[PDB]
């Protein structure tokens, strides 16, 4: 068994999606969110569900908040965290921003850590592997891997924000059982 080390995403987020309204109902939450899921693997051979939900940042054009959880039905226990270069001092969301052409521009985590202005965009992810024996100090054992959103400034194999149907999804990961 090989633990996942990278998950690659591509495809589009519809620039025209409505912002989530104040006191949204069930149908309104669904309408304002693009939800994605994909299977990753831990080092013990077990599969986990990686869920990333995207929604526009109210009040900032070309900006979306992505909320990430491994195993949504156990998300309190997995305590997923995401960051740029780290998963310490951070929550489980990031803001992805696009330029006026619809192309990826930056990702910023909840601590303010931000991608370089050019090149590939990697978001580090970690979560507790539940049931795994804790570590030396007793802390829960975690699995870390990257989410690769593509190359800044290009549409090929990269997440985009055009005025077109939402299609963003994970296309590949590298672990297996």
XYZ file of C-alpha atoms in Angstrom:
177
model
C 0.000 0.000 0.000
C 1.205 3.540 -0.867
C -0.165 6.611 0.905
C -1.385 9.451 -1.278
C 1.195 12.268 -1.661
C -0.575 14.487 -4.248
C -4.085 15.099 -5.604
C -4.359 17.152 -8.806
C -7.448 19.313 -9.535
C -8.516 21.044 -12.753
C -11.648 22.373 -14.259
C -13.811 25.378 -13.754
C -15.686 27.357 -11.057
C -18.610 29.297 -12.544
C -17.941 33.009 -12.045
C -21.741 33.519 -12.262
C -22.581 31.416 -9.182
C -24.584 33.486 -6.680
C -23.085 34.542 -3.384
C -24.589 32.718 -0.417
C -27.515 34.853 0.868
C -27.993 35.876 4.555
C -30.013 33.123 6.376
C -29.722 30.788 3.363
C -32.071 27.775 3.221
C -31.133 24.192 2.151
C -31.718 24.922 -1.549
C -29.777 28.212 -1.363
C -26.735 26.616 0.273
C -26.650 23.946 -2.435
C -27.048 26.591 -5.157
C -24.121 28.690 -3.906
C -21.679 25.827 -3.336
C -19.755 23.637 -5.769
C -18.890 20.402 -3.935
C -16.231 17.893 -5.002
C -15.090 14.533 -3.635
C -12.270 12.093 -4.379
C -10.699 8.997 -2.763
C -7.247 9.172 -1.100
C -5.338 6.426 0.696
C -3.413 6.288 3.957
C -0.234 4.311 4.647
C -2.289 1.501 6.225
C -4.131 0.799 2.977
C -7.430 2.415 3.970
C -9.369 4.755 1.705
C -10.650 8.151 2.881
C -12.997 10.638 1.210
C -11.509 14.056 0.398
C -14.270 16.664 0.175
C -13.574 20.198 -1.046
C -16.455 22.667 -1.182
C -16.106 25.970 -3.006
C -18.187 29.108 -2.578
C -17.632 32.742 -3.492
C -16.181 35.128 -0.910
C -18.946 37.702 -0.313
C -17.750 41.166 -1.180
C -14.581 40.261 -3.112
C -14.745 39.631 -6.869
C -12.766 36.730 -8.319
C -12.289 35.153 -4.881
C -13.553 31.796 -3.596
C -13.309 30.018 -0.257
C -12.535 26.299 -0.425
C -13.382 24.280 2.696
C -11.587 20.930 2.942
C -12.397 17.873 5.023
C -11.128 14.315 4.958
C -13.970 11.919 5.917
C -16.862 14.390 6.220
C -18.971 12.025 8.316
C -16.117 11.997 10.900
C -14.766 15.494 10.310
C -14.618 16.506 13.968
C -12.371 13.540 14.706
C -10.192 13.917 11.620
C -9.484 17.596 12.337
C -8.423 18.388 8.793
C -6.111 21.358 8.340
C -4.840 23.078 5.182
C -2.113 25.591 4.523
C 0.527 26.998 2.244
C 3.752 25.301 3.275
C 2.337 24.171 6.640
C -0.650 22.697 8.381
C 0.108 24.298 11.769
C -1.618 27.461 12.924
C -4.298 27.098 10.256
C -7.924 26.024 9.844
C -9.374 23.881 7.029
C -10.165 26.538 4.408
C -8.294 28.709 1.939
C -9.098 31.573 -0.425
C -8.294 31.002 -4.088
C -8.151 34.118 -6.230
C -8.292 34.502 -9.998
C -7.222 37.253 -12.385
C -9.491 39.146 -14.794
C -8.912 36.476 -17.443
C -10.291 33.743 -15.169
C -6.886 32.191 -14.504
C -5.518 31.090 -11.142
C -3.653 33.910 -9.384
C -3.070 32.933 -5.745
C -4.050 30.839 -2.749
C -4.000 32.225 0.814
C -4.557 30.095 3.913
C -6.290 31.247 7.093
C -2.983 32.337 8.668
C -2.213 34.555 5.657
C 0.419 32.307 4.106
C 0.256 32.886 0.362
C 1.591 31.238 -2.762
C 4.428 32.674 -4.844
C 3.214 34.968 -7.659
C 4.224 32.438 -10.360
C 4.502 28.684 -10.730
C 2.660 25.672 -9.397
C 0.115 25.999 -6.554
C 0.335 23.365 -3.823
C -1.906 23.390 -0.728
C -0.718 21.153 2.091
C -3.418 19.020 3.739
C -3.296 16.947 6.901
C -5.809 14.935 8.976
C -5.924 12.431 11.828
C -5.878 8.772 10.738
C -8.498 7.606 13.213
C -7.822 4.386 15.071
C -4.117 4.500 14.199
C -1.859 4.194 17.201
C -0.862 7.669 18.502
C 2.722 8.885 18.329
C 5.546 8.929 20.953
C 4.117 11.985 22.780
C 0.552 10.628 22.492
C -0.616 13.015 19.762
C -2.789 11.507 17.012
C -1.013 10.144 13.933
C -1.667 12.331 10.867
C -1.331 11.862 7.117
C -0.053 14.819 5.101
C -0.360 15.284 1.324
C -0.617 18.076 -1.242
C -3.525 19.361 -3.338
C -2.106 20.684 -6.662
C -4.415 23.300 -8.220
C -2.254 23.864 -11.294
C 0.034 26.576 -12.740
C -0.635 30.279 -12.095
C -1.778 32.140 -15.213
C -2.742 29.183 -17.373
C -5.897 27.135 -18.005
C -4.276 23.816 -18.948
C -4.604 21.233 -16.156
C -5.377 24.123 -13.778
C -8.441 25.354 -11.899
C -10.173 28.243 -13.695
C -12.988 30.752 -13.018
C -14.700 31.385 -16.375
C -18.343 32.288 -17.049
C -19.186 28.651 -17.823
C -20.573 25.597 -15.957
C -18.787 24.525 -12.742
C -16.750 21.420 -13.580
C -13.794 21.563 -11.117
C -12.835 18.160 -9.762
C -9.853 16.088 -8.787
C -8.454 14.241 -11.789
C -5.720 12.072 -10.253
C -4.009 10.966 -7.060
C -0.982 8.743 -6.537
C -1.737 6.390 -3.628
C -3.102 2.856 -3.823
C -3.945 -0.342 -1.898
